[PDB]
């Protein structure tokens, strides 16, 4: 409960070390060096404070046991107590966990009787709950709402209701409780400051390894290796080029040779940003007046809404704390001529900025940041500057000439917002408001100062659906590629609309020729009550959906979740929560007499429509999932029981050269309590669930890294705004980046059959029995990749 201050020695050395200073000072100046090292020391300093505040709230709460510093002693203390309870003789392990947590919590916030009463009272409460959970299928319906509850008091209150319903349907001493705790303590005594020092020492250590990362005031330290990049000073937490769950998976990158990967990261780190002072000036004012600046600009349904408004209030507090941090960071570096961001990678190869305040943030955070080195905008830069503004306004589904026309027709509004941003709220109403306001300021400058006016604003181009774009390129899918604007097109293609149009074709077919409605008797298991129930035929079901009107908004989420592995089942939950339930609360949905029947009907229709719109996407993710299932399985001779092939990790190499290992590992045994917080084999399921998204994310990351090196080497582009598939640069450089991103993607998939390369990596790993099971590669389609270079709306 007494924490040493890491600051005085461990944080002092970071600034103190001469070798970082002398190296930093020569290139960037002594004062810029000192500030960078002072800043890095401050980041570690802030992190120590953050842990101290969290620990303090945990002492008052008694949730010290939940804190990571009190975890390691409990793990060595617990097994000896469980055996002692058996030797002295609810599950034995759970009682041992309950006693340790209650003892540590009671001491944190001292009578022996009071702790014994608490342990017994919690023990009785848990067993009354545990029996319902340990029945279990009914508890599974309860468990999701139990997981949604917050705090033991709400858990017990929710537990209380489910027990009463469970009694109604029929699934079914104070001194002794104090005596139960006393004997638990008596066994615990058989199983102190020295233990308290262990949590106290660990608390210091965890305070030293969790800094609040901050932007660099000098160009970041280039990555020459696996660790030590980004920030210049030797720290307690050295940056890793790849964020790894294990130190082993970090080390497999130590040997590997990835010259192009390193260049891409170093180039991105080199990009110099500055705070957009004009946008910051606006944001500082509207923030003092509104919780969210753009949230509200003047211009049985009850029970569902009640759950949302509690969430909506909790959401509103969660948004503000993020805002107040970003704003302070924006104010703090507002005067600096330039700031930089260090970059590392996730284990799949996507590029992330390391500091908490980064160009990859929300719209306000994005609008608060701009590049520091501009070039005169010229004719083409103005053209792309206007296109970006239309995109920020939400005009992104029309051809480019209509996007320019929208800007010119709204020129006076744009000018008004630039002149008096607090007097005209039109910018706040646009889809990406603060980024739009930033565009307004530059648009005014070009009008005030002409095409020679210097512009450093980041103009971001985003691929429409990167995963489907990449999957269609791999397998040459024309129909899917056209739906994602990979092919050159007269008009912007909406994949959500195409799916919706195909759904309407099925809807019309089933309404004319459909299964008739059928009636089946149903008997409730508990009641034993026989009620006649109607299964809706496809004809009746289509009629309800046709009455509602099926738009792109019905099919939108199902297409987005496709890359994440969602399929027909997950769609039915989406349709219910997205369109069917919200219509009911609005009073619409009179046609949706049975919601779940409509959602199941719709989810089948969306899945059929998606599978014919993008065949390569669906085919590829099935092929990858089959591969992961085979490798992840352990092969055992049935008679022998010995394993012929152990569970195998899945590994591949991106065209950039980045390798990735996907090792999802599940623990052997875990303990979870209903009323108290719950306390190395490869998981085959997570291997299958993740192989399709992780592989395609690995491909988009290589595309990004290839684009930034190609843009810097073929063209002069030195400033990059990168969000995983969004590519930004200054307007003078904007047209070349648009070219470079098309040239990179065309180059790789003309050069590399990524799926065949994947097959060569695991083909030997398959057991003799497994080879017949593995599906063949999906057939290539009719698409020509050269047409991607001509496409306007691919944006990538």
Partner RNA sequence: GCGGCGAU
CA neighbor of 547 nearest in space, from 570, 580, 498, 514: 580
- Kindly state whether residue 320 participates in binding DNA, applying the rule CB under 7 A: no
Of the pair 135, 422, the CB lying nearest its own copies is at 422
Burial class (CB in 10 A: 0-12, 13-18, 19+), 144: exposed
Q: CB-wise, 80 or 291, nearer to its own copies? A: 291
305 binds, among RNA, its own copies, DNA, none (CB under 5 to 8 A by kind): its own copies
Q: Is 556 a catalytic residue?
A: yes
Closest separation in Å from C-beta 690 to DNA:
4
How many angstroms separate the CA atoms of 681 and 632, rounded? 10
Indicate the burial class of 454 (C-beta count within 10 angstroms; 0-12, 13-18, 19 or more): middle
What is d(CA 162, CA 738) in angstroms, rounded to the nearest whole number? 58
Q: Could you say which of 108, 360, 581, 597 contacts RNA (CB under 7 A)?
A: 360
Does 645 engage in binding with RNA (CB under 7 A)?
A: no
In three-state secondary structure terms, 681 is strand
How far out from the chain centre does Cα 326 lie? Answer: 19
Q: Which of RNA, its own copies, DNA, none lies near 50, with the C-beta cut-off 5 to 8 A by kind?
A: DNA
Residues 6 or more apart from 238 whose CB is under 8 A from it?
A: 227, 228
Residue from 32, 283, 495, 723 touching RNA (CB under 7 A): that is 723
Q: Please, what's the b/e burial string for 680-712 (b: 16 or more CB within 10 A of its CB; e: otherwise)?
A: eebbbebbbbbbbbbbbbbbbbbbbbbbbbbbb
Residue 454, helix vs strand vs coil: strand
Phi, psi of 442 (to 5 degrees): -70, -40
Stretch that binds DNA, among 57-65, 166-174, 267-275, 291-299 (CB under 7 A): 57-65
Of residues 125 through 144, those in contact with DNA by CB under 7 A are 137
Question: Which of the residues 459 through 498 are near RNA (CB under 7 A)?
Answer: 462, 466
Nearer to RNA, 35 or 143 (CB): 143
Instruction: Please identify which residue in 629, 645, 739, 767 interacts with DNA, judged by CB under 7 A.
Output: 629
- Decide whether 431 or 505 has the Cβ nearer to RNA: 431
The helices-and-strands tally (H runs, E runs) of the chain is 34, 18
Under the binding rule (CB under 7 A), the answer on residue 31 touching RNA is no
Q: Examine residue 594 and tell whether it contacts DNA (CB under 7 A).
A: no
CB of 285 to its own copies, least distance (A): 6
- Of residues 172 and 308, the one with the C-beta less far from RNA: 308
Inter-residue contact 199 to 320 (CB < 8 Å) = no
Residue 257, judged by CB atoms within 10 A of its CB (0-12, 13-18, 19+), counts as exposed
**What is the DSSP code string of 208-229?**
HS------BSSPPBP--SSBS-
Binding site for its own copies (CB under 8 A): 285-291, 293, 296-298, 302-303, 305-306, 309, 320, 422-423, 425, 428
State both tokens at 430: 């646009």
Nearer to its own copies, 428 or 624 (CB): 428
Rounded-to-integer distance, Cα 512 and Cα 611, Å: 23
Sign of CA dihedral 370, 375, 376, 381: negative
597 binds DNA (CB under 7 A): no
- Which of residues 318, 491, 515, 596 is near RNA by CB under 7 A? 318
Nearest approach, Cβ of residue 96 and DNA (Å): 21
Helix (H) or strand (E) holding 696: helix 684-714
CA distance 250 to 470: 27
| Residue 373 contact among DNA, RNA, its own copies, none, beta carbon within 5 to 8 Å by kind | none
Residue 533 within binding range of DNA, rule CB under 7 A: no
- Closest distance of CB 724 from RNA, Å: 4
343 belongs to the binding site for DNA (CB under 7 A): no
Site stretch for RNA (CB under 7 A), options 21-29, 318-326, 449-457, 782-790:
318-326
DSSP label of 230: B
Q: Determine which one of 125, 656, 700, 725 is catalytic.
A: 725
Distance CA 394, CA 748 (A): 31
Residue 74 interaction partner, one of RNA, its own copies, DNA, none, beta carbon < 5-8 Å per kind: none
Residues near RNA (CB under 7 A), total: 24
Residue number with CB closer to its own copies (155 or 403): 155
State the nearest-atom distance from the C-beta of 287 to RNA, in Å: 15
In angstroms, give the least distance from the CB of 289 to its own copies: 6
Q: Which of residues 122-161 bind RNA (CB under 7 A)?
A: 144, 147-148, 150
* Site track for DNA across 149-188, x = CB under 7 A: -xx-------------------------------------
Binder of DNA out of 15, 42, 66, 143 (CB under 7 A): 66
Picked from RNA, its own copies, DNA, none, the partner binding residue 296 (CB below 5 to 8 A depending on kind) is: its own copies
Residue 291 contact among DNA, its own copies, RNA, none, beta carbon within 5 to 8 Å by kind: its own copies
Residue 685 CB contacts under 8 Å (≥ 6 apart), including other chains: none
Residue 174 near residue 117, CB atoms below 8 Å: yes
User: Considering CB distances under 5 to 8 angstroms, the limit depending on partner class, which of RNA, DNA, its own copies, none binds residue 302?
Assistant: its own copies
Burial classification of residue 93, based on how many CB atoms lie within 10 Å of its CB (0-12 exposed, 13-18 middle, 19 or more buried):
middle
Task: Indicate the SS3 state at residue 171.
Answer: coil
Cα 17–chain centre separation = 37
Does 322 bind RNA (CB under 7 A)? Our answer is yes
Contact between 310 and DNA per CB under 7 A: no
Least separation, in Å, of the C-beta of 214 and DNA? 12
329, 357 Cβ separation under 8 angstroms: yes
- Contact string (CB under 7 A) for DNA, positions 567-586, x = contact: xxxx----------------
Which entry of 221, 263, 556, 625 is annotated as an active-site residue?
556
Residues whose CB is less than 8 angstroms from the CB of residue 645 and which lie 6 or more positions away in sequence, other chains included: 633, 634, 635, 765, 767, 770
Distance CA 144, CA 609 (A): 31
Q: 726-729 and 459-462: which strand pairing?
A: antiparallel
Segment interacting with RNA, rule: CB under 7 A, options 202-210, 440-448, 670-678, 727-735 = 670-678
Return all residues near 353 (Cβ < 8 A) that are at least 6 apart: 341, 342, 343, 359, 360
Nearest Cα to 723, choosing from 707, 712, 746, 734?
707
Q: Which partner in RNA, its own copies, DNA, none is near 290 (CB below 5 to 8 A by kind)?
A: its own copies
Q: Which region among 4-12, 300-308, 343-351, 469-477 touches DNA (by CB under 7 A)?
A: 343-351
Nearer to RNA, 150 or 157 (CB): 150
- Minimum CB–partner distance for residue 755 and its own copies (Å): 52
Instruction: Give the chain's end-to-end CA distance (angstroms, integer).
Output: 54
In the set 66, 346, 396, 462, the catalytic residue is 462
92 phi and psi angles, rounded to 5 deg: -60, -35
Q: What minimum distance in Å lies between the beta carbon of 217 and its own copies? A: 28
CB 344 within 8 A of CB 229: yes
Among 136, 314, 533, 714, binds RNA (CB under 7 A): 314
The enclosing H or E element of 116 equals helix 112-133
Residues assigned a catalytic role: 462, 556, 725
Q: Where on the chain is the footprint of RNA (CB under 7 A)?
A: 144, 147-148, 150, 311, 314-315, 317-319, 322, 360-363, 462, 466, 672, 677-678, 723-726
- Interface positions with DNA (CB under 7 A): 50, 53-54, 57, 61, 63, 66, 137, 150-151, 212, 243, 245, 318, 321-322, 346-348, 350, 352, 356, 564-570, 600, 626, 629, 632-633, 677, 684-686, 688-690, 693-694, 697
């Amino acid at each position: 409960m007494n924490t040493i201050n890491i600051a005085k020695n461990d944080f002092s050395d970071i600034e103190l070390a001469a070798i970082p200073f002398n190296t930093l000072a020569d290139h960037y100046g002594e004062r810029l060096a000192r500030e960078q090292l002072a800043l890095e020391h401050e980041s570690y300093e802030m992190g120590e404070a953050r842990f101290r505040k969290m620990f303090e709230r945990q002492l008052k709460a008694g949730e010290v046991a939940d804190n990571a510093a009190a975890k390691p002693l409990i793990t060595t203390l617990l097994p000896k107590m469980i055996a002692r309870i058996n030797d002295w003789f609810i599950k034995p392990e759970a009682v041992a966990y309950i006693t340790i947590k209650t003892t540590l919590a009671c001491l944190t916030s001292t009578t022996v009787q009071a702790v014994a009463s608490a342990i017994g009272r919690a023990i009785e409460d848990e067993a009354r709950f545990g029996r319902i959970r340990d029945a279990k299928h009914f508890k599974k319906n309860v468990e999701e709402q139990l997981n949604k509850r917050v705090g033991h008091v709400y858990k017990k209150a929710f537990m209380q209701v489910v027990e009463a319903d469970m009694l109604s349907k029929g699934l079914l001493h104070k001194e002794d409780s104090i005596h139960v705790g006393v004997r638990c303590i008596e066994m615990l005594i058989e199983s102190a400051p020295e233990y308290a020092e262990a949590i106290a020492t660990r608390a210091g250590a965890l305070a030293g390894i969790s800094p609040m990362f901050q932007p660099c005031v000098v160009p970041p330290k280039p990555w020459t290796g696996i660790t030590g990049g980004g920030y210049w000073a030797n720290g307690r937490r050295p940056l890793a080029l790849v964020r790894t769950h294990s130190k082993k998976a970090l080390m497999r990158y130590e040997d590997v040779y990835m010259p192009e990967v390193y260049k891409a990261i170093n180039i991105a780190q080199n990009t110099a940003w500055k705070i957009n002072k004009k946008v910051l000036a606006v944001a500082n004012v509207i923030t003092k007046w509104k919780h969210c600046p753009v949230e509200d600009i003047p211009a049985t349904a009850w029970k569902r809404a009640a759950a949302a408004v509690y969430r909506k209030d909790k959401a509103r507090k969660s948004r503000r704390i993020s805002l107040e941090f970003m704003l302070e960071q924006a104010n703090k570096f507002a005067n600096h001529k330039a700031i930089w961001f260090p970059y590392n990678m996730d284990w799949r190869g996507r590029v992330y900025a390391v500091s908490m305040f980064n160009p990859q943030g929300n719209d306000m955070t994005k609008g608060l940041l701009t590049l520091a080195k501009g070039k005169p905008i010229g004719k083409e830069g103005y053209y792309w500057l206007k296109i970006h503004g239309a995109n920020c306004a939400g005009v992104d589904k029309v051809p480019f000439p209509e996007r320019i026309k929208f800007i010119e027709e709204n020129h006076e509004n744009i000018m008004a917002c630039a002149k008096s941003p607090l007097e005209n709220t039109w910018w706040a109403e646009q889809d990406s408001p603060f980024c739009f306001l930033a565009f307004c300021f530059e648009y005014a400058g070009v009008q005030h100062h002409g095409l020679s006016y210097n512009c450093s604003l980041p103009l971001a181009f985003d691929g429409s659906c990167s995963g489907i774009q990449h999957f269609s390129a791999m397998l040459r899918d024309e129909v899917g590629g056209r739906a994602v604007n990979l092919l050159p097109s007269e008009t912007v293609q909406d994949i959500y609309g195409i799916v919706a149009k195909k759904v309407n074709e099925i809807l019309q077919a089933d309404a004319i020729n459909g299964t008739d409605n059928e009636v089946v008797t149903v008997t409730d298991e508990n009641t034993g009550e026989i009620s006649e129930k109607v299964k809706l035929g496809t004809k009746a079901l289509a009629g309800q959906w046709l009455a509602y009107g099926v738009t792109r908004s019905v099919t939108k989420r199902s297409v987005m979740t496709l890359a994440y592995g969602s399929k027909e089942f997950g769609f039915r939950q989406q349709v219910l929560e997205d369109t069917i339930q919200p219509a009911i609360d609005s009073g619409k949905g009179l046609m949706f007499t049975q919601p779940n029947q409509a959602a199941g009907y719709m989810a089948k229709l969306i899945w059929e429509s998606v599978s014919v719109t993008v065949v390569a996407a669906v085919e590829a993710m099935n092929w990858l999932k089959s591969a992961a299932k085979l490798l992840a399985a352990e092969v055992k001779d049935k008679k022998t029981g010995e394993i012929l092939r152990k569970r195998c990790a899945v590994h591949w190499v991106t065209p950039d050269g980045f390798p990735v290992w996907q090792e999802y590992k599940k623990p052997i045994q875990t303990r979870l309590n209903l009323m108290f917080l719950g306390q190395s084999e490869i998981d085959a399921h997570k291997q299958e669930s993740g192989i399709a998204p992780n592989f395609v994310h690995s491909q988009d990351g290589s595309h990004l890294r290839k684009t930034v090196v190609w843009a810097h080497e073929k063209y002069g582009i030195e400033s990059f705004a990168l969000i995983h598939d969004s590519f930004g640069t200054i307007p003078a450089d904007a047209a070349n980046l648009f070219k470079a991103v098309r040239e990179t993607m065309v180059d790789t998939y003309e050069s590399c059959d990524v799926l065949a390369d994947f097959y060569d990596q695991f083909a030997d790993q398959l057991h003799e029995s497994q080879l017949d099971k593995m599906p063949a590669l999906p057939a290539k389609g009719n698409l020509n990749l050269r047409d991607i270079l001509e496409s306007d709306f691919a944006f990538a």
